[PDB]
Design a binder for this molecule. Structure first.
Ligand SMILES: Nc1nc(N)c2c(OCC3CCN(Cc4cccc(Cl)c4Cl)CC3)cccc2n1
Lengths: 289, 286
């Protein structure tokens, strides 16, 4: 009947997805509440009966054999799944919050003059990466390894993939070689490594999980989440966060770019998104005005 | 509706993630496809509802967590409904759920396998020509450069109900005829591509107040229809075919052509095909 509090005043949309028809709202009450609203899937019988029984339809437009409408269905199709977290702690607000993103186009020179110095101004640990590579941690999770210290890598499932089905298959290849921070460091010297990751990684997944290479999206992030070269292997059906064109770069194309254009990744402009509160965004914007 | 008496033949496709359903029905007893999609939330109106007397049913509760059924007022329950009628067999197969496989098409694969296979088909883009010729949707045009060679029409895509900016989605359709896809692009088309990118973004800034750094602007390969068009989408929208395996950023298409005139004839392109697509077999064979 009633929500477990009084007087909802919106502070912030923590996250919204128009694709998934879901929104996460931070509201002030009286104290903090999170309310999550999600539209519901259609039930076939409910739609089929609506379409034969006086539906309230209103034209947005038509063109040839196509027409689009606003439909206002009866109550049974209008359920909205509503999840209330109250009181919400700062941890709740942080787990749901996603910053709005802005696109930047970074020239080779912007990288050299602005981005790289900004990265060098930070002290970020990747010791967790080295512990895996050195077999001190997570050795039991490695699915495949090419042990070569120059051209080798380990393949490990993503932590959030429960390995309970192939629909959301997701593994990460991490190279043994140290000091390759991102796409920007890649030269023809790295072709053997990159080929190994692509071919051996796909083969390992075929053997272990019986998933063929043409069912795999294999790509790198730019900007990456940590600055030691790593490659994502996801089921093609799994539209994983970070597989968008504004972040993802297909390993096969990275290889072919290096093969025909050796300085590609030092010379060409790369496009990525930054959180609107990221100080790097302001630096690149200031440098580009 | 453009017909009477929808009799369900088949659920062609459904998604619980996207809250969408595709139905094949018999009408006027003719085939029709009807597509129903739940709409994005109206944030301020939802917040207004929550602070009032929303109609709720408690499904379960455990200390700080509770789950409800909310039944909003009529104005918040809009379902975007798209009708394809009369629907051909191509339409019925197109919307059928199907498994996708990736393929890497070399420049020679395209010329010797894909293009002949395309050229062999007879596909209608009458809706596209109706927009360009002002026979349909003329009132909906957001921006036009009418130059027959380097010009285009910018128009909200069918996908977008225009009711919120979170899923902002327009298409630029070039006036020039016979540019089928990426594969046809050469430096000849650079003025057109530049016009689309810069005039398209300026139009969106003026109309919607959305800056270029809030947009993801890209082409599809393979395209769903073979007349060059560009997708202008909110960066925050997980937009159709915006994945790396389909989307090509317009700015990069332009720069690729500037660096290598034959880029899109010579280079290998990667894209997904449906398992039941005969092109997939033809390419795998070759
Ligand atoms: N303004 C405007 N925009 C448009 N896009 C129009 C329009 O677009 C038809 C395509 C038809 C196919 N697919 C994509 C598609 C292909 C295959 C399977 C699926 Cl599941 C889908 Cl989703 C989007 C729509 C038609 C008529 C008028 C239009 N008018």
């Amino acid at each position: 009947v009633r929500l477990p509090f009084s007087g909802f005043r919106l502070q912030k949309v923590l996250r919204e997805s128009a694709r998934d028809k879901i929104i996460f709202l931070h509201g002030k009450v009286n104290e903090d509440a999170v309310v999550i609203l999600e539209k519901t899937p259609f039930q076939v019988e409910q739609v089929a009966q609506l379409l034969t029984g006086s539906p309230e339809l209103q034209l947005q437009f038509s063109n040839d054999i196509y027409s689009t409408y606003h439909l206002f269905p009866p109550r049974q199709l209008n359920d909205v799944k509503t999840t209330v977290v109250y009181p919400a702690t700062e941890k709740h607000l942080q787990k749901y919050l996603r910053q709005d993103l802005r696109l930047i186009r970074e020239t080779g020179d912007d990288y050299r003059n602005i981005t790289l110095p900004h990265l060098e101004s930070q002290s970020l640990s990747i010791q967790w990466v080295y512990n895996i590579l050195d077999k001190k941690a997570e050795a039991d999770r490695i699915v495949f390894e090419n042990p070569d210290p120059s051209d080798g890598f380990v393949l490990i499932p993503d932590l959030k993939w429960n390995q309970q089905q192939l629909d959301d298959l997701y593994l990460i290849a991490i190279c043994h070689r140290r000091g390759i921070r991102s796409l920007r460091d890649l030269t023809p010297e790295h072709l053997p490594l990159l080929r190994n990751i692509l071919h051996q990684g796909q083969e390992a997944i075929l053997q272990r999980y019986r998933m063929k290479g043409d069912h795999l999206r294999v790509y790198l992030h730019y900007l990456p989440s940590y600055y030691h070269l790593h490659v994502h292997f996801t089921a093609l059906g799994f539209e994983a966060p970070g597989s968008g064109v504004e972040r993802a770069h297909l390993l096969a194309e990275v290889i072919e770019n290096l093969e025909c254009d050796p300085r590609h990744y030092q010379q060409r402009t790369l496009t990525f998104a930054l959180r609107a509160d990221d100080p790097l965004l302001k630096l690149l914007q200031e440098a580009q005005q």
